[PDB]
Design a binder for this molecule. Structure first.
Ligand SMILES: [Mg+2]
Ligand SMILES: [Mg+2]
Lengths: 227, 40, 180, 255, 250, 213, 457, 226
RNA sequence: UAAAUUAUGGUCAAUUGUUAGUAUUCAUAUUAAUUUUUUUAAAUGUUUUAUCAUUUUAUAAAGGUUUAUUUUUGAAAGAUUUUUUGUAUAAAAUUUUAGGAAUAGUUAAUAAUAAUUUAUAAUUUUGAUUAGAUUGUUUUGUUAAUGCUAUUAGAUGGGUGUGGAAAAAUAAAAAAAA
């Protein structure tokens, strides 16, 4: 196929890998193609008990008898806002709080900047539907200094795990068009002072001593006695 | 089968499975060491 | 790919595919037990004879004294014998040409016979599973590294044609003078 | 519900398309029966294939089996013409005159610059090859199409004297196109199929008479019996019938 | 793999055929489809001469031949002029104008984009005007060398395409010859007088110190989706090879 | 690519050759109708069901299988999807576009495809209905499509067929031509069974020739 | 006992040519090629099918025995119908080049003279139509559901609907050899025999023909003079045999081959190769009496001259004496770069020439050998994203990267090269990884995966 | 151990040395037939099942097996069993078909002799060449209709008499004067005049009602008295 | 219409019941099997995942068939990669009953026709069609032996038709992506 992990060796069932190829194994189903994913259940499992401090008024409940004190309504609004923010932040929540809908800004997830992984997206456009936490976003995905030539629709723009640092220089008004970032390899000449590579195609980070000690303790080669 | 550690991410969902498919970074690292022996 | 899966005996990637070498044997009294190395598909029906690519041979898991051999003073030669009958040509054809799979018990038997390296299942509890470090592996690689030309030649001999024709054979085979 | 769920006549698979594009990329939709209609049903008869160089220049002369005007085929085709004219009056220009019917055995193009020496050899070869064959009998029945329906002819089924006729025509082709160079439309080692042309669309008439003769005109007479005719003469003739009101006489052998 | 003829279902009924790709000019996916072809065409024009790409004036075609000759026609003009019998639509959609970002930045800043629709609604004229000289070098023999916009200053490009057609409708596939530029070679060429200025070196300088090592590696603290080799995803989920693992958390 | 040019050159030189008595009709056989396997498979005019190890003389093709691509809005359960249909006609070597249109409208054999007048076009360029395939240089590999009268505004929802999923179908609409064939009333036997695919079959986005993720 | 057809004889003679054994061709010619005859003007060129298909009559079906009635497809029956197009000129050419490879001048000259006389005084045989079995007849396919050219948002994908990434190798616009006319086939035969001379020289001296491997590559061989004189005599014989008919033909392949022999056998500078090509072009124009506009050189000739520039700019790298680079004696980077630049600007001004990865590789090799250190700029500007670049480009660029003043810039350029390899689907070559791991002691760049390192250890 | 006696069987788990391990299916079972119908009232109208009927396609006794050694296989080297068949065309009433009667062979080992069994086939032919009486050769091919999978390959013997009769306009073969019986009971020729038609009908209906009365059963010895 | 021999070759064919004037294989033996003396369950939680979903998991007994059951490489094995090459639904023969007669959405041609085309249609006494019986062409038992006498488990209509393939509604001696 396309990506025969460790060649075509079939010593075990797990030798072929969890998924055989990045392309879908069955021609019928395209969605089953291999793609990076984030935990949807955990990221959408917003804290429920945090809203139990103060009651929340329903939108369809507009009758005068069900109206509450304005102080209580403001408390409910604060509770709803913190309930939305508790699990995390999505680019649809950062865009309204950034100028020009945050166009031209650098968005990254927490796991995108930990370890040798280094990926971010330069925002190009955002479309908002009725809900302020929903819609779509397009931008340039940059991986280790290499960026996509054409804008692409971002994946998982709704899950609360995004982070962004606001800079005024990179903001792009609606009059202009967001420029794709230059490529560190081709567009801008390479310079270690400006940017230094964290992981190359044949690189793999050295084993940390804490993980090594934990693995040895698990395997029992290191002595261990209960307290 | 695929081993699921007890110290993994607990899916706070009652409408589905009680444990997620993610893993601790240590679990990912130790899995690579075990997978290295599979390749040998 | 079934509405109600046969939960007792499931498999992977459906049927029929991925021929696999197993050891079939009817569950009888242990003193009358003998298995049969055989290559079959991943999925088998009620009778094993439906999916039977080839038959490898019998195996008797009973250590027996060598009565056929004369009573010899050799200590190693007087140990118990575990006889196994296997096929080599069909096994090689299915392993290499058709790229079949093997189970742990046939793998261990073939490792004993010398056809295969020891299986992953059999391991010594005394020796733990080791770990690896990229820096030390690179240091060893720099310490000793084979030549690219010789490594290509040995890879060619191992994988592609190995029975080569030398200049002596070429001179013998070349046409004789009258038809030149 | 009337018959089989998938009729045998509809289990057609097309190999002219790419293998993997018919299942998913597209679905080809056409009536494949028309091109697989057999030559027997469609009236097509395989004529000798002419080489490209000989297919350009127009023919000059042709062998024919001269027949008296009284012969049975002449009045059979006369009655056929009467029926055709009664049914439809627009096929009269396509229909040929009853007096211009001959059984053609071969067509060739003799250049006019050097025709005089070639015709003598042709006629002497015909005489020397027909000095022994007795008069032939041929049973005519059936209809056929040549030049993609441009030429409509009466089929000549195999019968008595037909084997002698085909052997004689093979010998004629060997003695005419073989030893001396003359442009035969077919091959000297191939045998020309005898026929009598009942209808034909001229290239000048192709402008307003369509591109081919519709099959409904002769569908009822596709297998009609035109009977047995005896031929005892042969003539090498030229395409000139208007001036004398009859076949042009260039060479004749009283077989 | 797909190497089977359709015999399971009747040909009259398309039962599992893929939908035909259609591009609509009321949607930004039209700009998404067309913009990279535009930038490639501009690069080709600036590098090598291209026939029928330079336009002295708007082409005049009668109505009967309008749908026969205009579709597939793409060229450029020096002036900012628009053909008649076309209603004008301006790009006010940020998503629609986002796709021209690479063209504006890397190739040449775009001044405006307009979609022209005829009265019969059977055509689409995409006219895109770029203000300013080309950022990339322009060869003296190139098609753009005859354009006064390079070296008013703004120049426009016209493209005609039938509406509601597959993406193959525009004939931008032929404009893909990768003619290289001679920007570095012109410096050392005989016409330029920098040949004596340039100083080549054959031997690499001697190394006295090893390269600076990478900073201390900190293992990630967040949870991980699993190994990319097993999950068959590309290293960063964007590009690379599954077998060659790099750029992930470890 | 190479096959078409080499075949054309071979045919050209075969035509130019003048020393040829002609192929033997008896020696050159035709394709047979009877063979193994319970499928009637048609091949090219130069291919035979039997093994023919010799390369026969090239011939001028008198019957070109012109393939015209029509738009078709099949009804999937999720919604209306626009896909492609191919109509194949057997036209003579010098058939004018007028008779090509006659052949396509006589061999379309589909209720929806030939609903209104249409014009044949190639790579977006309309074809003049006065000249023949000789002027255009059309071969059997040429890709020809058709443009109807109302396919230039199909992006409008009014022109698009109205599905009952999002649009309301009236008592006057159920009596129309396509909506009578479709049945909004679920019968016990469900006589009009159509192709079904999930709304998430292609993911959050529709089918496209590029990547949007 | 399968009697080979003329095509099978041609294939076996090609095998004999590449093997260098002439005795096999001796046996083949004695066994089968004796009866082969050229096409006479009065003979029929496209011979018709002669073998009637197998059939059995009533008597031959009822009375004849089963073994006689049995019929399996026997190639000896249709060998005559497969020898129907009279392609004996190809067999004569292959036999002549076999004799040349075996070094028998008498027989080689006999075959060449007979072929030359036949091609000069015989009509051109008609080539057979393309074989339906050897090359599959293309089938109609609607290219409507194929992936777009920009399907991948990271690189320009090579669409199956039409080529878009640019050819990775130059191919001259020439048809199959069977379609050549008489004089054109004579020119092709001379080109082929010269190519066989090249192959024989390379086999005799493999070390002196490879690029930038040993010092022997930069020294003229002691047998090249005789081969060059033979080539000059052969081309002069060709020009004497063909007069007016030579002018109205195509000599792209012949020019490329003579350029290649004047490049590798007698190692000449790129300027010398260009001068030889110009002299050949002007002589070809002048021999024919007409307006005689000078024919522009093609992509093959430009590839040859750029390869000559690369060969003259080649250098031995990491010699056993620990020397970083060893160059040819009398090496002038200034003049080499000047000539390369003017050639490149000329071929860029010429619009009929299509660039390819081979000539881009030659240009990159020239620039990196001359040490101007603009080869990386040229590669990123014109070759990184335009063509399917192989790992040899990075192999050449690695020494340029090592030429950097600072090891940090060298290391980062190496990292970016590896990233390009991982991105644009151009895996790094074994020799490139060998160089990387050799310099790992000072660059600290890993070039092997964890899995393959562990398994190798 | 099949060759060992009953008392000699020490165990039954495996064959100790070698041979054939076969299941001892009990043939002596004493199967019983249970009569569930009256003697003259078996539900079937032609064949009556009054005892245990032997079941099998090839295992029945006496043994009957196909015989591939016949005239067709002696003449032809058939790629597949029964691919080619020689027979006489009998019946030409369906267009573009030709019904051929070809006889195969079945061998009885018990008697050590063979007999020929005739089978009819539908052979497809174009141009309508197969006339009644032709000795034709047919071969298997692709399925053409529901019951057409043979096609004629050569007409070994032309029916000159049939062709001449067709040319004269008469049928290729006169229809036979004896056919299948429509009913078991004899068919009596009706010759009654118009006046006697009703009387003959009355007699026939009386005979039919008497046959219906036969359903009642034997007439009692003592006439019914109340 | 001639003998044999450079001599056993080329590897085991062998039958056992004490009756009862005679005719005709018919009571009682031996082997094989059933039968008494109590031998002898078919297990309950399959698993992973991106979470109210998706991905992997395809022939057990039910329904009574004698002119009858026949098909894929699109998943998997499967490998630098792209790409490519091919198929296949059809047959032939063997087919039971003590007292034996009619059978039918029906044959062929045509076609992606015809509930309404055209035709002197098709099945069958060489045993049809319904009905009864029985899961079809490597299995046993008996004997010296052409015989006689046994054998098994599983393909029982469709109806949004998923899937490569319906075999898809409890039933393991199938380790199923560490
Ligand atoms: Mg009983
Ligand atoms: Mg029954």
């Amino acid at each position: 196929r396309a990506d025969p992990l460790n060649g075509g060796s079939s010593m075990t069932l797990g030798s072929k890998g969890s998924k055989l190829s990045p392309e879908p194994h069955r021609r019928r189903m395209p969605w089953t193609a291999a793609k990076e994913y984030v935990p949807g259940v955990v990221l959408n499992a917003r804290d429920k008990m945090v809203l139990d401090g103060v009651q929340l008024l329903d939108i369809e409940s507009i009758d005068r008898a069900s109206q509450l004190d304005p102080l209580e309504v403001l408390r409910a609004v604060v509770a709803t806002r913190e309930y939305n923010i508790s699990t995390g932040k999505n680019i649809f929540q950062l865009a309204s709080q950034a100028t020009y809908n945050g166009r031209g800004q650098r968005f990254y997830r927490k796991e995108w900047q930990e370890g040798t992984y280094d990926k971010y997206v330069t925002l190009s456009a955002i479309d908002f539907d009725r809900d302020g936490n929903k819609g779509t976003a397009y931008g340039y995905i940059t991986f280790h200094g290499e960026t996509t030539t054409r804008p692409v629709q971002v994946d998982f723009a709704d899950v609360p795990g995004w982070y962004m640092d606001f800079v005024e220089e990179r903001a792009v008004p609606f009059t202009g068009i967001v420029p794709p970032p230059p490529s560190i390899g081709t567009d801008v000449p390479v310079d270690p002072h400006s940017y230094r590579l964290k992981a190359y195609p044949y690189y793999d980070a050295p084993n940390p001593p804490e993980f090594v000690e934990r693995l040895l303790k698990d395997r029992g080669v290191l002595p261990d006695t209960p307290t | 089968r695929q081993i699921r550690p007890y110290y993994n991410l607990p899916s706070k969902s009652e409408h589905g499975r009680k444990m997620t498919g993610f893993l601790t970074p240590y679990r990912h690292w130790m899995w690579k060491q075990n997978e290295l022996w599979r390749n040998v | 790919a079934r509405a109600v899966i046969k939960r007792r005996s499931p498999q992977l990637w459906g049927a029929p595919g991925a021929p696999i070498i197993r050891m079939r044997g009817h569950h009888v009294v242990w003193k009358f037990q003998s298995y049969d190395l055989v290559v079959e598909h991943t999925h088998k029906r009620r009778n094993s004879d439906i999916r039977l690519l080839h038959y490898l041979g019998k195996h008797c898991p009973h250590p027996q004294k060598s009565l056929w051999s004369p009573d010899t003073p050799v200590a190693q030669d007087r140990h118990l014998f575990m006889l196994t009958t296997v096929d080599i040509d069909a096994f090689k054809y299915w392993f290499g040409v058709k790229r079949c799979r093997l189970s742990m018990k046939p793998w261990a038997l073939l490792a004993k016979a010398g056809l295969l390296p020891p299986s992953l299942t059999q391991n010594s509890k005394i020796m733990p599973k080791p770990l690896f470090d990229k820096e030390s592996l690179m240091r060893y690689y720099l310490a000793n590294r084979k030549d690219e030309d010789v490594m290509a030649r040995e890879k060619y001999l191992n994988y592609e044609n190995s029975m080569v024709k030398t200049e002596e054979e070429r001179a013998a085979e070349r046409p004789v003078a009258p038809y030149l | 519900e009337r018959g089989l769920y998938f009729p045998i006549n509809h289990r057609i698979v097309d190999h002219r398309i790419a293998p993997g594009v018919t299942v998913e990329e597209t679905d080809v939709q056409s009536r494949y029966r028309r091109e697989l209609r057999t030559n027997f049903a469609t009236g097509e008869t395989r004529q000798t294939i002419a080489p490209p160089w000989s297919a350009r220049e127009r023919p000059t002369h042709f062998f024919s089996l001269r027949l008296p005007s009284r012969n049975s085929v002449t009045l059979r085709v006369k009655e056929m013409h009467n029926h055709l004219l009664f049914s439809h009056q627009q096929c009269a220009p396509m229909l040929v005159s009853p007096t211009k019917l001959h059984i053609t055995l071969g067509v060739m193009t003799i250049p006019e610059n050097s025709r005089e020496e070639l015709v003598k050899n042709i006629q002497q070869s015909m005489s020397e090859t027909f000095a022994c064959v007795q008069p032939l009998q041929l049973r005519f029945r059936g209809l056929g199409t040549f030049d993609f329906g441009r030429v409509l002819f009466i089929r000549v089924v195999p019968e008595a004297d037909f084997g002698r006729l085909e052997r004689a025509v093979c010998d004629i082709r060997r003695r005419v196109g073989g030893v001396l160079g003359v442009d035969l439309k077919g091959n000297p080692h191939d045998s020309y199929v005898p026929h009598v042309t009942v209808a034909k669309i001229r290239p000048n008439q192709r402008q307003q008479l369509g591109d081919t003769i519709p099959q409904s005109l002769w569908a009822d007479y596709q297998h009609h019996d035109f009977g047995d005719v005896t031929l005892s003469t042969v003539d090498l003739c030229r395409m000139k019938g208007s001036p004398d009101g009859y076949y042009h006489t260039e060479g004749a052998v009283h077989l | 793999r797909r190497f089977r003829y359709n015999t399971k279902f009747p040909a009259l009924v398309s039962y599992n055929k893929l939908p035909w790709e259609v591009v609509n000019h009321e949607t930004p996916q039209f700009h998404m489809h067309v913009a990279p072809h535009y930038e490639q065409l501009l690069t080709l024009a600036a590098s090598s001469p291209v026939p029928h790409i330079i336009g002295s004036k708007h082409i005049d075609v009668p109505r009967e031949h309008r749908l026969r000759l205009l579709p597939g026609m793409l060229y450029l003009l020096d002036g900012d002029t628009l053909p008649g019998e076309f209603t004008i639509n301006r790009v006010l959609d940020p998503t629609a104008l986002q796709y021209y970002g690479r063209l504006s930045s890397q190739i040449v800043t775009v001044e405006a984009v307009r979609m022209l629709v005829p009265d019969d609604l059977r055509l689409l004229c995409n006219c895109i005007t770029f203000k300013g000289p080309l950022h990339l070098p322009v060869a003296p023999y190139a098609s753009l060398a005859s354009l006064r916009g390079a070296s008013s200053n703004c120049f426009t490009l016209y493209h005609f395409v039938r509406p509601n057609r597959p993406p193959k409708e525009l004939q931008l596939e032929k404009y893909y010859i990768h003619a290289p530029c001679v920007a570095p070679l012109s410096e050392f060429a005989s016409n330029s007088d920098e040949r004596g200025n340039w100083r080549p070196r054959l031997q690499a300088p001697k190394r006295t110190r090893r390269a600076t090592p990478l900073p201390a590696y900190r293992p990630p603290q967040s949870y991980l989706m699993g190994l990319a080799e097993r999950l068959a995803v590309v290293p960063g989920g964007c590009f690379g090879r599954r077998s060659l693992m790099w750029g992930h958390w470890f | 690519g190479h096959y078409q040019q080499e075949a054309f050159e071979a045919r050209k030189r075969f035509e130019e050759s003048t020393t040829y008595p002609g192929p033997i009709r008896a020696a050159t056989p035709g394709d047979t109708r009877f063979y193994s396997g319970s499928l009637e498979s048609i091949l090219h005019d130069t291919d035979r069901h039997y093994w023919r190890a010799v390369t026969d003389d090239p011939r001028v093709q008198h019957l070109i299988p012109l393939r015209i691509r029509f738009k078709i809005f099949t009804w999937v359960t999720s919604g209306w999807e626009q896909r492609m249909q191919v109509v194949q006609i057997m036209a003579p070597k010098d058939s004018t576009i007028a008779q090509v249109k006659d052949l396509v409208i006589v061999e379309n054999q589909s209720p929806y495809l030939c609903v209104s007048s249409f014009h044949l076009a190639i790579d977006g360029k309309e074809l003049d209905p006065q000249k023949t395939l000789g002027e255009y240089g059309i071969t059997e590999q040429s890709q020809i499509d058709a443009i109807e009268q109302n396919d230039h505004l199909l992006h409008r929802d009014d022109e698009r067929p109205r599905d009952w999923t999002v649009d309301e179908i009236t008592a006057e609409d159920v009596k129309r031509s396509p909506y009578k064939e479709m049945e909004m009333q679920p019968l016990q036997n469900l006589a009009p069974r159509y192709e079904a695919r999930p709304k998430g079959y292609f993911g959050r986005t529709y089918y496209s020739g590029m990547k949007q993720s | 006992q399968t009697w080979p057809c003329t095509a099978t004889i041609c294939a076996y003679l090609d095998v004999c040519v590449e093997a260098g054994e002439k005795t096999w061709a001796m046996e083949a010619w004695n066994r089968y090629c004796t009866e082969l005859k050229f096409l006479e003007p009065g003979e029929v060129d496209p011979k018709p099918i002669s073998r009637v298909p197998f059939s059995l009559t009533r008597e031959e079906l009822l009375y004849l025995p089963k073994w006689k009635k049995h019929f399996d497809h026997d190639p000896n029956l249709d060998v005559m119908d497969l020898n129907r197009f009279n392609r004996t000129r190809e067999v004569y050419l292959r036999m002549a080049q076999v004799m040349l490879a075996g070094g028998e001048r008498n027989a080689f000259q006999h075959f060449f003279t007979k072929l030359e006389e036949a091609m000069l005084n015989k009509p051109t045989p008609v080539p057979e139509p393309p074989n339906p079995h050897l090359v599959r007849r293309p089938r109609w396919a609607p290219y409507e559901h194929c992936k777009s050219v920009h399907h991948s948002p990271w690189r320009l994908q090579n669409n199956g609907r039409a080529l878009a990434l640019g050819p990775p190798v130059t191919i001259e616009d020439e048809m199959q050899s069977r379609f050549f006319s008489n004089d054109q086939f004579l020119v092709h035969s001379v080109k082929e025999v010269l190519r066989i001379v090249l192959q024989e020289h390379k086999r005799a001296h493999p070390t002196e023909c490879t690029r930038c491997k040993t010092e022997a590559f930069f020294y003229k061989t002691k047998d090249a003079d005789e081969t060059l004189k033979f080539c000059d005599d052969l081309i002069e014989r060709l020009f004497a045999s063909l007069g007016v008919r030579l002018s109205n033909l195509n000599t792209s392949s012949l020019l490329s081959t003579i350029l290649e022999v004047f490049r590798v056998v007698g190692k000449e500078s790129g300027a010398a190769l260009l001068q030889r090509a110009n002299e050949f072009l002007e002589r070809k124009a002048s021999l024919g009496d007409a307006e005689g506009s000078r024919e522009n050189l093609t992509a093959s000739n430009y590839l040859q001259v750029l390869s000559g520039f690369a060969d003259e700019s080649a250098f031995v790298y990491n010699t056993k004496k620990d020397g970083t680079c060893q160059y040819k004696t009398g090496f002038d980077p200034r003049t080499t770069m000047r000539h390369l630049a003017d050639v490149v600007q000329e071929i860029a001004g010429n619009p009929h020439v299509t660039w390819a990865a081979d000539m881009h590789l030659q240009v990159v090799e020239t620039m990196v050998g001359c040490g101007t250190m603009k080869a990386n700029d040229y590669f990123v500007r014109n070759v990184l994203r335009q063509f399917s670049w192989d790992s040899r480009f990075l192999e050449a660029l690695y020494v340029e990267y090592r030429r950097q003043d600072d090891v940090d810039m060298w290391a980062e350029l190496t990292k970016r090269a590896l990233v390009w390899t991982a991105r644009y689907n151009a895996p790094a070559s074994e020799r490139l990884r060998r160089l990387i791991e050799d310099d790992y002691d000072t660059i600290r760049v890993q070039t092997r995966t964890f899995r393959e390192l562990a398994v190798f250890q | 151990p099949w060759w060992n006696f009953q008392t000699e069987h020490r165990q039954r788990c495996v064959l100790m040395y070698g041979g054939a391990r076969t299941k001892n299916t009990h043939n002596a079972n004493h199967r019983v037939f249970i009569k569930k119908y009256k003697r003259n009232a078996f539900p079937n109208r032609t064949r009556h099942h009054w005892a245990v009927s032997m079941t099998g396609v090839l295992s029945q006794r006496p043994r009957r097996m196909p015989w591939p050694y016949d005239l067709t296989s002696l003449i032809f080297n058939q790629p597949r069993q029964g691919s080619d068949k020689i027979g006489y065309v009998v019946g030409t009433s369906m267009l573009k078909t030709a019904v051929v009667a070809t006889n195969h062979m079945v061998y009885y080992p018990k008697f050590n002799q063979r007999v020929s069994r005739t089978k009819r086939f539908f052979a497809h032919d174009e141009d309508l060449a197969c006339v009644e009486g032709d000795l034709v050769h047919i071969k298997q091919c692709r399925k053409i209709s529901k019951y057409k999978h043979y096609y004629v390959f050569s007409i070994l013997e032309p029916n000159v008499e049939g062709r001449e009769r067709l040319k004269l306009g008469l049928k290729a073969v006169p229809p036979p004067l004896f056919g299948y019986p429509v009913s078991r009971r004899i068919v009596k020729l009706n010759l009654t005049s118009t006046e006697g038609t009703q009387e003959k009908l009355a007699a026939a209906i009386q005979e039919h009602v008497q046959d219906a009365y036969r359903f009642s059963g034997p007439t009692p010895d003592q006439p019914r008295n109340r």
